[PDB]
């Protein structure tokens, strides 16, 4: 399975790039590990945008 | 600056001879040095003009003087062997303006001793620390030229005179002066590695009450600490160093486990000077455990950034100190064991067997009686391997380390002769445990074995003559023998059940409570030195009373008797020598007892159990 | 814990250059927005609905690739469900279309003048982009060369 979940991790990258999401490789790994727990992703979509707003609040 | 070529040559050669970790570092091209136009620093009569034309002319040339550009009614005189630029104003300048110009001239003077560092003192010969100093002093000089251009644009619109310039340059001589002070002290005197970082922990403490210049000094040393932090981000977490620029306190030596990595005194920054001993140790443990086949990485690791007078960055260093010396200890005690190794030392040097030695003593008695170089070493190795396998001891796998060792001495190998007093052991140790136990400990264990051998040896001599007489109704020898026998068995009770076995037992608990290699080295040296001192060896005379007591014991049992010289086994001539030996023996016994009493216990306390020959005469 | 992965989300999205008090406030920001939605159709169908607007805006092979990957990822369901909700707020020759000189038995359609004209626009967008860089490099520096002195540098504050 360890063969399969590296290749599915690589194909998972392209559809996150072409859908124009804010994710790069690192944040993609954080988010795939976070969804693996069982969290609803429609909730995660708001906390990522609130972090990216309040990050710009400092600078 | 003419000095710089000599500096580069001397620096490069000095780096190269110490270690060959990197040679022939690049010397920057010759046309860089030959042009003074790659370095930031290299008319009409003013006397009859109107006053305002004079102020407008001088502010115009002064803005050129702030950079390396020739003025319209002023020039820059050549420097000398001197550092900062002086300038040459036009005759008949106004006496009002001349004083004000010398208030504005310190900006150009504090610009002269800035670019000469940046445009030369950054190269590989100078270390890898003059780099980043000229990599955050360059941004400030860029800012200087920015300010000069922004001033010139206002000058073109008729909107600059000497007074506006005078207001403008107070930010440029409260800030550029700090640089022109730091630069001519870092440059003068070799400041490489930690010495710079101590000078910038001295000149960031020089401003703590100004608050204008303090942030600036912190900015300069926060860029100069970054390459040092780069080297500190290997050594603490791996054993790996390359570093041919010798900017670090630890130096790679091209030659083991203590002769490779060594602290250098002038390569220590001031704010880690207290922590300098921990750095080398924590780094060294990771490399030496990979020398004995193990991992080198420290999986607790973070990145390091400087703060003036606050600590969070000498903190993660302690967390790798809480890994390195505790992964090496846990490596040693359970892998390539020090517990079974120490027990296999215990088995013979502390003579843990009584069986193996009485087998040995019976098998080798004839050869032990003969002097040295009247002995047969290949026969004795065979007899030792026999007597070992007959006994209890066959279970440890380190029994093979024993070889035949001759030390013909009478303890003149201090920390002809007979075979009994020329028998020792040489024990082979492994490379991981060689780090702690070495030639000194092995020598002390050998000397302890030598002292214990005589006490073991005289017992066989007593028991042989004791059984050989049993004739059955005789008591002439049976009095001297009984007195000596009680003594030589109580010395043997005192020494092991007091001097050796309890503290060996304590040491095997104390090593499990150690946390550093230094800790184990403390406990082991305590036991080995003090217990050997506890047994009767220490005096300047080395306690000859003990040896002469043993001498008259052996002389009584074998040298004078030979088991009544096989007379039946006369005039009671043999009983008179018993009497003479007995008087000498009383003298020696009292000498040893009084010597142990007078030096500030238990062997006297149990030998004299109820007033048993405790008074015949007493000193003073 | 799961609440610890939210600290690592704050770690990636804010790099370090203070910087020990901002991260706890951002951790509060990460916690405070998660539970407001929790108090108050298949997955690949939305992918088709988004490939449609691509094809409306031209750019055929991108839609043909987006449909190519979900077809083999069904031949991880909850992570693409995040990407459709993060869409459109992040950062974003060939001689076989209008060159009939290469191929093997090339298709016969007469000639072209109606996609060969949008083959210059393929370069015209690049030519219009690499001049906007030099408009935005002359502007950032004319904002420094022209000002009253020291209002872009804090050196007057020293």
Swiss-Prot record, chain A:
What's a GO cellular component annotated to this UniProt protein? interphase microtubule organizing center
Q: Which family does it belong to?
A: Belongs to the MOZART1 family.
Q: What is the protein's known function?
A: Required for the recruitment and the assembly of the gamma-tubulin ring complex (gTuRC) at the centrosome. The gTuRC regulates the minus-end nucleation of alpha-beta tubulin heterodimers that grow into microtubule protafilaments, a critical step in centrosome duplication and spindle formation.
First and last residue shown, out of the full length, are 17 to 75 of 82
Q: Name one GO biological process term.
A: gamma-tubulin complex localization
Keywords for this entry?
A: Acetylation, Cytoplasm, Cytoskeleton
Tell me the protein's name: Mitotic-spindle organizing protein 1
Q: How does it assemble?
A: Associates with the gamma-tubulin ring complex (gTuRC) consisting of TUBGCP2, TUBGCP3, TUBGCP4, TUBGCP5 and TUBGCP6 and gamma-tubulin TUBG1 or TUBG2; within the complex, interacts with TUBGCP3 and TUBGCP6 to form a luminal bridge with actin that stabilizes the initial structure during complex assembly. Interacts with TUBG1.
Could you name the domain of life of the organism this protein comes from?
Eukaryota
Q: Which organism is it from?
A: Homo sapiens
Localization recorded for this chain is: Cytoplasm, Cytoskeleton, Microtubule organizing center, Centrosome; Cytoplasm, Cytoskeleton, Spindle
UniProtKB/Swiss-Prot annotation, chain B:
Give the record's GO CC terms.
centrosome; ciliary basal body; cytoplasmic microtubule; cytosol; gamma-tubulin complex; membrane; microtubule organizing center; nucleoplasm
- Result, substituting residue 422 to P: In CDCBM15; uncertain significance
Which GO terms label this protein's molecular function in UniProt? gamma-tubulin binding
Summarizing the annotation, the consequence of altering residue 138 to C is: In CDCBM15; uncertain significance
Localization, UniProt: Cytoplasm, Cytoskeleton, Microtubule organizing center, Centrosome
What is one process in the GO biological process aspect for this record? spindle assembly
Q: Which UniProt keywords apply?
A: Cytoplasm, Cytoskeleton, Disease variant, Epilepsy, Intellectual disability, Lissencephaly, Microtubule, Phosphoprotein
Intrachain disulfide bonds: none
Organs and tissues of expression = Ubiquitously expressed.
Q: Does the keyword Phosphoprotein apply?
A: yes
Q: Which family does it belong to?
A: Belongs to the TUBGCP family.
What biological function has been recorded for the protein in this entry? Component of the gamma-tubulin ring complex (gTuRC) which mediates microtubule nucleation. The gTuRC regulates the minus-end nucleation of alpha-beta tubulin heterodimers that grow into microtubule protafilaments, a critical step in centrosome duplication and spindle formation. Plays a role in neuronal migration.
Q: How does it assemble?
A: Component of the gamma-tubulin ring complex (gTuRC) consisting of TUBGCP2, TUBGCP3, TUBGCP4, TUBGCP5 and TUBGCP6 and gamma-tubulin TUBG1 or TUBG2. TUBGCP2, TUBGCP3, TUBGCP4, TUBGCP5 and TUBGCP6 assemble in a 5:5:2:1:1 stoichiometry; each is associated with a gamma-tubulin, thereby arranging 14 gamma-tubulins in a helical manner. Gamma-tubulin at the first position is blocked by TUBGCP3 at the last position, allowing 13 protafilaments to grow into a microtubule.
Q: What disease has this protein been linked to?
A: Cortical dysplasia, complex, with other brain malformations 15: An autosomal recessive disorder characterized by global developmental delay, variably impaired intellectual development, speech delay, facial dysmorphism, microcephaly, and varying degrees of cortical malformations including pachygyria, thin corpus callosum and subcortical band heterotopia. Most patients have generalized seizures.
Curated annotation (Swiss-Prot), chain C:
Signal peptide residue numbers:
none
Q: What is this protein called?
A: Gamma-tubulin complex component 6
Self-association state and partner proteins as the record states = Component of the gamma-tubulin ring complex (gTuRC) consisting of TUBGCP2, TUBGCP3, TUBGCP4, TUBGCP5 and TUBGCP6 and gamma-tubulin TUBG1 or TUBG2. TUBGCP2, TUBGCP3, TUBGCP4, TUBGCP5 and TUBGCP6 assemble in a 5:5:2:1:1 stoichiometry; each is associated with a gamma-tubulin, thereby arranging 14 gamma-tubulins in a helical manner. Gamma-tubulin at the first position is blocked by TUBGCP3 at the last position, allowing 13 protafilaments to grow into a microtubule.
Functionally, this protein is described as follows: Component of the gamma-tubulin ring complex (gTuRC) which mediates microtubule nucleation. The gTuRC regulates the minus-end nucleation of alpha-beta tubulin heterodimers that grow into microtubule protafilaments, a critical step in centrosome duplication and spindle formation.
Query: The organism sits in which domain of life?
Result: Eukaryota
Q: Which disease is it linked to?
A: Microcephaly and chorioretinopathy, autosomal recessive, 1: A syndrome characterized by microcephaly, cognitive impairment, underdeveloped retina and choroid, and epilepsy in some patients. The more anterior parts of the retina, near the periphery and pars plana, have a grayish hue and diminutive vasculature similar to retinopathy of prematurity. Visual impairment becomes evident during the first year of life.
Which family does the UniProt entry place this protein in?
A: Belongs to the TUBGCP family.
- Location in or out of the cell: Cytoplasm, Cytoskeleton, Microtubule organizing center, Centrosome
